[PDB]
Design a binder for these strands. Structure first.
Length: 68
DNA sequence: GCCAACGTTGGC
DNA sequence: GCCAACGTTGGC
């Protein structure tokens, strides 16, 4: 399920997906979805898209919070 | 050719 | 030793 991420612009959602198989089974990946539904796999990728819209320097990609 | 899913490693 | 970040690839 895609959760709302209030630290990002309206419409932004975070999803955490448990790996199901392989040696990394049990681990999890985090994704964000833009208001238009585009998928983001890393903080630099978000940064390049959001630019000056928000400062992501204090942003924890995994938890989706601003942690200073 | 695409991309979801897992593998992989450099930087800490 | 962990994990953020991105590379690889099997299945479609």
């Amino acid at each position: 399920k895609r959760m709302d991420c209030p630290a990002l612009p309206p419409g932004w959602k975070k999803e955490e997906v448990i790996r199901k198989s392989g040696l990394s089974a049990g681990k999890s990946d985090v994704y964000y979805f833009s208001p238009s539904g585009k998928k983001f796999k890393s903080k630099p990728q978000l940064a390049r898209y959001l630019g000056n819209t928000v400062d992501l320097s204090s942003f924890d990609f995994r938890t989706g919070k601003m942690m200073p």
